[PDB]
From a paper:
To date, more than 10 MARTX effector domains have been annotated, including several domains of unknown function in Vibrio species, among which the fifth domain of a MARTX toxin from Vibrio vulnificus CMCP6 is a Ras/Rap1-specific endopeptidase (RRSP). RRSP catalyzes sequence-specific cleavage of the Switch I region of the cellular substrates Ras and Rap1 (18, 19) that are critical for a myriad of signal transduction events, including innate immune defenses. Structural and functional bioinformatics and cell biological studies revealed that RRSP belongs to the TIKI superfamily, and it is composed of an N-terminal region mediating its localization to the plasma membrane and a C-terminal region responsible for cytotoxicity. In this study, we determined the crystal structure of an RRSP from the sepsis-causing pathogen V. vulnificus CMCP6 (VvRRSP), and we demonstrated that it is a metal-independent TIKI family endopeptidase.
Deletion of N- and C-terminal flexible regions resulted in a core construct (residues 3596–4072) that produced crystals diffracting X-rays to 2.7 Å, with four VvRRSP molecules in the asymmetric unit (see under “Experimental procedures” for detailed information on structure determination and refinement). The structure of each of the four protein chains is essentially identical, except for the N-terminal α1 helix spanning residues 3596–3609. Size-exclusion chromatography revealed that VvRRSP exists as a monomer in solution; hence, the structure of chain A was considered representative of the subunit structure and was used in further analysis. The enzyme activity of VvRRSP (residues 3596–4072) was confirmed by in vitro KRas cleavage assay, demonstrating that the construct was functional and processed Ras and Rap1. The VvRRSP structure can be divided into an N-terminal lobe (N lobe, residues 3596–3722) and a C-terminal lobe (C lobe, residues 3740–4072), and the N lobe can be further subdivided into the membrane localization N1 domain (MLD), consisting of four helices (α1–α4), as characterized previously, and the N2 domain comprising three helices (α5-α7). The C lobe can also be separated into two subdomains, the C1 domain (α8–α12 and β1–β3), and the C2 domain (α13–α22 and β4–β11) that adopts a typical α + β TIKI fold. During refinement of the RRSP structure, we noticed that the electron density map around residues Arg-3988–Gln-3992 located close to the active site in the C2 domain is disordered, indicating flexibility and a potential involvement in substrate recognition. Although we did not observe any metal bound to VvRRSP during refinement of its structure, we biochemically examined whether it belongs to the TIKI metalloprotease family. Superimposition of VvRRSP molecules in the asymmetric unit reveals different conformations for the MLD fingers, indicating flexibility.
Residue numbers in the entry: -4 to -1, 3596 to 3987, 3993 to 4069
The structure:
């Protein structure tokens, strides 16, 4: 009958029933109403995204222009006054990455107040050109709370589930990969390790095998793009909380790189370790014969030592520290720094060994991977010294990836080696890649040497120290 369907129709023209995607907008509004600080800003950006997503799927919906005005009101409230100066860049990122735009938005507020001018454009340029800041969906859905750890990935293995299960349980029976839980019902694995942390445990054949089937499983999920296995795991199987952690940390490092370029006194460094300062130091160091009085020159009002090693053999640093450890102890050295290990996981393992005297399996696997002598850790514990890991959690094809690592290594070196107890020196071992400063078109990052006010050193097979010159194009 013509009656009804018509009666049904204007029941809709008046009060249209709440759809599944309009409800998401109505719920997103409640977040804008209740949230404070940065969360409220991010919610507003997420609101605009859900509005823009709604209009695309539903062009003829009558809610469009009502939502369009709503988006206008929100956008105007956000970028009022001096905030419109960087509106274009931020709002462009907010179209795909609301939470990332919010972090930059907070910086833009401080820059509207005169603080750290130029940081906003730097963080925008990074978010547009650095692949690691590209839109990363990750895994969204049901996540277990039974885990005794914070899962970084939720990888669906599929056909490689059987082979992964074997090498995982083989590793867990050896005290490796403890933070990992399987689920055959979904054939997924709740992994608590990053791509970088697994790579430092590949010294054990059991882990490297499981690492293989993991990387292969990711390539099955996305063989159409040019993304590496590491990138796929982030875009497809990464935990949402972990992605927020990575984005937050990566924003902090850019801000760290920014402040390093203005506040680090390079003028004093070049006067002390370059030109005349380099000549005065080299000649005074050359006059010293034997190990002990050479260390006296190098630690003459200097917080520590920076010895460099390059790729291949080149391990005089690791050899000198192990053999002449008490010679360092005499000079006041109490800390030994290694760039060979990543701080986030290696440091609790090292501290537990230095305290109990028992080396865990996970630490033993790391030492095997990085070809580190266990005798070093034994002599360090016997001498009451502390070994610290100095590497960041970054990758080993853009320039931004190298600048991130160079800056993140600086922050680690600062929070560990810069402010030791008065009288305590240190001996850190870096590659010659970080003892130098990064001078690229896309930015500048001061080297470890600059932020720690120390020269770059090189020790020969005859235990003779020579001061390396700064690499400047």
């Amino acid at each position: 009958g013509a009656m009804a369907q018509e009666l049904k129709e204007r029941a809709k023209v008046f009060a249209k029933p709440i759809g599944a995607s309009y409800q998401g907008i109505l719920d997103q509004l409640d977040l804008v109403h209740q949230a404070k600080g940065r969360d409220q800003i991010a919610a507003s950006f997420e609101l605009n995204k859900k509005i823009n997503d709604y209009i695309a799927e539903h062009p003829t919906s009558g809610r469009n222009q009502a939502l369009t005005q709503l988006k206008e009101q929100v956008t105007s409230a956000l970028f009022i006054g001096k905030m419109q100066v960087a509106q274009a860049g931020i709002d462009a990122i907010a179209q795909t990455r609301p939470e990332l735009a919010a972090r930059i938005f907070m910086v833009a507020i401080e820059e509207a107040n005169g603080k750290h001018v130029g940081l906003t454009d730097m963080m925008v340029r990074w978010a547009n050109e650095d692949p690691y800041l590209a839109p990363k969906h990750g895994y969204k859905g049901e996540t277990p709370s039974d885990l005794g750890f914070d899962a970084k990935y939720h990888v669906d293995l599929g056909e490689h589930y059987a082979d992964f299960k074997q090498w995982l349980e083989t590793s867990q029976s050896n005290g490796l990969l403890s933070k990992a839980t399987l689920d055959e019902s979904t054939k997924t694995v709740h992994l608590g390790y990053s791509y970088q942390e697994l790579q430092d445990l590949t010294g054990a054949e059991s882990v490297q095998m499981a690492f293989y089937f993991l990387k292969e499983a990711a390539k099955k999920a996305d063989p159409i793009s040019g993304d590496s296995a590491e990138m796929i795991l982030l875009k497809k199987f990464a935990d949402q909380s972990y992605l927020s952690q990575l984005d937050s940390d990566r924003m902090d490092q850019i801000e760290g790189i920014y402040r390093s370029s203005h506040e680090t006194d390079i003028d004093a460094w070049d006067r002390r370790y370059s030109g005349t300062g380099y000549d005065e130091l080299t000649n005074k160091l050359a006059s010293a014969t034997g190990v002990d009085e050479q260390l006296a020159v190098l630690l003459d009002d200097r917080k520590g030592l920076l010895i460099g090693e390059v790729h291949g053999s080149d391990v005089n640093g690791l050899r000198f520290v192990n053999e002449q450890m008490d010679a360092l102890k005499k000079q006041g050295v109490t800390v030994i720094g290694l760039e060979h290990l990543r701080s986030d996981l290696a440091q609790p393992l090292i501290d537990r060994y230095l305290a109990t005297g028992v080396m865990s399996s996970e630490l033993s696997a790391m030492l095997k991977t990085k070809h580190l002598d266990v005798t070093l850790f034994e002599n360090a514990r016997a001498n009451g010294m502390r070994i610290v890991a100095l590497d960041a959690n970054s990758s080993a094809g853009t320039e931004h990836g190298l600048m991130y690592r160079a800056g993140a290594a600086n922050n680690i070196a600062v929070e560990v080696l810069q402010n030791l107890p008065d009288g305590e020196k240190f001996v850190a071992i870096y590659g010659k890649a970080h003892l130098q400063s990064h001078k690229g078109i896309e930015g500048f990052v001061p080297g470890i040497t600059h932020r720690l006010d120390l020269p770059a050193l090189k020790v020969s097979d005859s235990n003779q120290f020579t001061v390396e010159q700064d690499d400047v194009s």
